[PDB]
Amino acid sequence: GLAPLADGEKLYGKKGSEGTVTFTKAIGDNAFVEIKTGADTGFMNGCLGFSESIDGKNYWVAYVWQTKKSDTISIDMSSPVQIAEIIGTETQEVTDADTIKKLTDKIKTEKSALLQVWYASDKTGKQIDPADSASESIEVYIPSASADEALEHH
Amino acid sequence: APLADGEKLYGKKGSEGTVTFTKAIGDNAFVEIKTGADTGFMNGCLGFSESIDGKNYWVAYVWQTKKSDTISIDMSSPVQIAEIIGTETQEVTDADTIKKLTDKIKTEKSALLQVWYASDKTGKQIDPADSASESIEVYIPSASADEAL
C-alpha cells in the first residue's frame, strides 16, 4: 500500500493549529503526504514527526520527505530516518535496532503526527521563508479500512 | 534572564507552527509557556533551516519545562544540527559549519515553534503535545532593550 490511492480510499487527517495532524484511527504502516507546490517553488523538504517515551527515556522520531513538484509522497512508517533520545536539553542519536523497532511499533499505533515543512527554495535556488509559503496546500492521509483489506488479501 | 512587558517584541504565530518577527531574531529568543493544569512535562524546539554551498541543513534549539515559565534560548548554542541528504540525515559536528549556520539564523525573521512531547502529572503522554499548554509565545528583546548592551 505504497501507491497513492483513489479519492474514495483516502482517510485524511485533520490539521490542528500548530503543525499537528490527527486521524480518527491509528496511522498504521503507510502515510501519504500530498503537496501542491507554489508556481515558483523548486524544492521543499520537511517531516512527519513523533515522540515516544520508553523505560523513562524520551525520543523524537522524524520521517523526512522532499519534493521538487506537486506530488504525493508515500511514507513507510517502518522506515524513520532520524531518531534521537532527548536528555534534558541535549540530544543523542539512536542506532539500536531494537529500540528503533520498538519506536516504530508504537508510532504505528498513534493517531496524530507533527507535520513540519522545514526548508524550501525557489526556481533560482533562493530560500523561501517561511518554508510553508512555498506550498499552496499540504495534507496527509492514510488508507481507508477498505483499502487496507484489499491490500492484504492480495 | 526574564524581561519586562514593554521590552518584549513578540512574534506572530502562523497557523502552521511558524513564528514571524518584524526584525531579525538576533542573539536571544525567549519561549514563554503557560502549562495546562495537569501538565507535568513538555519539550520541543525552535527550528530553522539554511543552505550553504549547495548543502541543506536543519537546526533545532531544544527547550523543556515542568511548569509555566520563560525559557531563554541562546541562538549561538543550537543542540541538534543535521545535513539533510535526500531523505537521509547526517549529524553535524564541524564547529565551523555550525558557526556559519548560527550567523545566518541570527538574521532570520522567522522560526519554527514545535512542541514535540508532553506528559501529564501521572507521567502519561498528552497527545497532541501542544494540548498540554494553554499558551506558547515567543519574543525577542526590543531595540531599546538591546541598546542596553
Instruction: Work out the angle at residue B74's Cα, subtended by the Cα atoms of residues B13 and B102, and round it to the nearest 5 degrees.
Output: 85
Using an 8 Å Cβ cutoff, are A49 and B80 in contact? no
Is A19 an interface residue toward B (CB < 8 Å)?
A: yes
Q: Which of B32, B44, B58, B13 is nearest to B140 (CA)?
A: B32
- Tell me the nearest-neighbour CA distance from B146 into chain A, angstroms: 25
Distance CA B115, CA B44 (A): 4
Task: Identify the DSSP state of A13.
Answer: P
Option in B18, B47, B51 nearest A132 (CB): B18
Distance CA A61, CA B12 (A): 27
Distance CA A66, CA B132 (A): 30
Q: Which of A129, A70, A80, A86 is nearest to A100 (CA)?
A: A80
118-137 of A, contacting B, C-beta below 8 A: 118-119, 121, 125, 127, 129-132
Residues 6+ apart with CB under 8 A from A26: A108, A109, A110, A111
Distance CA A50, CA A47 (A): 10
Phi and psi at B129, nearest 5°, equal -65, -35
Task: Identify the DSSP state of A119.
Answer: E
Q: Is A104 left (phi over 0), alpha (psi -120 to 50) or beta?
A: alpha
The total number of structural domains in chain B stands at 1
Is A55 an interface residue toward B (CB < 8 Å)?
A: no
- What letter represents residue A86's amino acid? I
Residues 6+ apart with CB under 8 A from A102: A54
Using an 8 Å Cβ cutoff, are B74 and B41 in contact? no
Is B49 an interface residue toward A (CB < 8 Å)?
A: yes
Using an 8 Å Cβ cutoff, are A106 and A112 in contact? no
| B101 grid coordinates | 549556520
Domain that holds residue B117: 1-149
Asked if B86 and A93 come within 8 Å (Cβ–Cβ), the reply is no
Phi and psi at B77, nearest 5°, equal -125, 60
DSSP-derived secondary structure for A29-47: TEEEEEEEE-TTEEEEEEE
Long-range Cβ pairs for the range A151-154 (8 Å, 24+): A151/A1
Largest Cα span, chain B: 48
Distance CA B65, CA B47 (A): 17
Asked if A114 and B114 come within 8 Å (Cβ–Cβ), the reply is yes
By C-alpha distance, the chain B residue nearest A73 is B87
Using an 8 Å Cβ cutoff, are A85 and A59 in contact? yes
Residue B73 β-bridge partners: B29
- For CA atoms A81, A37, A43, B139, give the dihedral sign: negative
Option in B86, B110, B128 nearest A129 (CB): B110
Tell me the three state secondary structure of residue A148.
helix
End-to-end CA distance of chain A: 11
Strand order in the sheet with B110-120: B12-14, B18-20, B110-120, B39-52, B55-65, B80-85, B88-91
Option in B16, B91, B108 nearest A129 (CB): B108
Resolution in A: 2.0
Using an 8 Å Cβ cutoff, are A85 and A92 in contact? yes
CA dihedral of residues B90, B91, B93, B96 (deg, nearest 10): 60
ω into residue A4 within 30 of 0, thus cis?
no
Distance CA A2, CA B122 (A): 38
Asked if B82 and A82 come within 8 Å (Cβ–Cβ), the reply is yes
- Tell me the nearest-neighbour CA distance from A153 into chain B, angstroms: 30
Instruction: Work out the angle at residue A116's Cα, subtended by the Cα atoms of residues A113 and A120, and round it to the nearest 5 degrees.
Output: 155
Asked if A51 and B109 come within 8 Å (Cβ–Cβ), the reply is no
- For chain B, what is the HEC assignment? CCCCHHHEEECEEECCCEEECCCCCCCEEEEEEEECCCEEEEEEEEEEEEEECCEEEEEEEEEEECCCEEEEEECCCCCEEEEEECCEEEECCCHHHHHHHHHHHCCCCEEEEEEEEEEECCCCECCCHHHHEEEEEEEEECHHHHHCC
